[PDB]
Design a protein around this ligand. Structure first.
Ligand code: MOO
Ligand code: MOO
Ligand code: MOO
Ligand code: MOO
Ligand code: MOO
Ligand code: MOO
Ligand code: MOO
Ligand code: MOO
Lengths: 69, 74, 69, 71, 70, 69
């Protein structure tokens, strides 16, 4: 699928924290940046995610806030 | 403030699209990545954002989905 | 791309209301259900959406609330 | 109450997966479509949800993305 | 309707900023606190919201972050 | 940090329910209102949150719906 989400950032899974119905996937997206994703355990399984998997961090633009110092 | 949001990514503003009540801020966060943020025009003004401003893309972890390529067969 | 979002509902575009930076797409997913999506104008154009387009309403499970009468 | 959320889709609970502080509710909304919802366990209990309950999937329009087959 | 959203804060509309497809509704919830809501113009119209209307700010718990003084 | 989020509501923590990857923090913001926040256990710990902590409920304007009677 091609998705409307403005942010689709390629990266590699560096850690997966398994929970009860959700888990937290951490992706190394390059440039010294990592992104954490809290998604359902069902999806972690269905997408076959493991540490070292290639994946994408997908974020709708309306979910992104801006901060400054 | 220190914020719970797991994702707080430093970057530089490369473009701002001004709308009616919202606008879209594009941040270059390095490594060839850009992040687009759709936020209120009021916030854009109050934060003094301009092209070239240093800022952060702030994303709650529950807002981030994971994708894989179409030819991966889990 | 294949996505973690638990909800990926096939439907046809029945209307697009254009805004300044966002627009609102209405998708008929069948059975008398329609879904409204508020997304960037950039995305509406990039996906080539028009009345009658085949598409999907994509919703993260953590964005779905449950209501009762 | 009546809510601004543009999407309020009637359906029946087909499953509830209990987690620690959240659970996942699946609703059959008709037309062969199901909606999965990740909400607090407290809300699952407070709303009296069980398999067979009548309910609604409620989604804010700004939470909905559009995808296409990009063949 | 009764909703799973854990946050439902009563207040009065103090302002509505109309946009193109969205508008921004501000509610006075008391205590010198206001909540701003960015929602569709269609909903603002359908709910009959005007300055002075009694309403509620409704927020899913997964949408709320916590911040602290550093 | 200063944040674009239009809603930044001061309050005191009155409850913490710990989960597997998430927890739920309840903040009393005054006027008889409490705001519940479902966030990662990691952040709950990193922010040092306990019953009695002073904190803020932070909500993006696009996450706030309006309801009426
Ligand atoms: O155009 Mo989006 O789907 O709001 O990022
Ligand atoms: O721990 Mo968060 O605020 O869900 O990213
Ligand atoms: O939270 Mo999900 O598993 O991306 O719908
Ligand atoms: O295009 Mo808007 O109405 O400023 O979100
Ligand atoms: O008008 Mo809404 O509450 O953004 O779906
Ligand atoms: O109940 Mo959890 O901590 O969201 O899996
Ligand atoms: O996640 Mo909730 O339990 O709908 O606020
Ligand atoms: O959409 Mo905002 O201006 O980050 O609350």
């Amino acid at each position: 699928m091609k998705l409307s989400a403005r942010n689709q950032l390629a990266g590699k899974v560096v850690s997966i924290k398994e929970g009860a119905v959700n888990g937290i996937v951490v992706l190394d997206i390059g440039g010294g940046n990592q992104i954490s994703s809290t998604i359902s355990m069902d999806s972690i399984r269905e997408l076959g995610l493991q540490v070292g998997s290639d994946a994408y961090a997908v974020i709708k633009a309306t979910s992104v806030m801006i901060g400054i110092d």
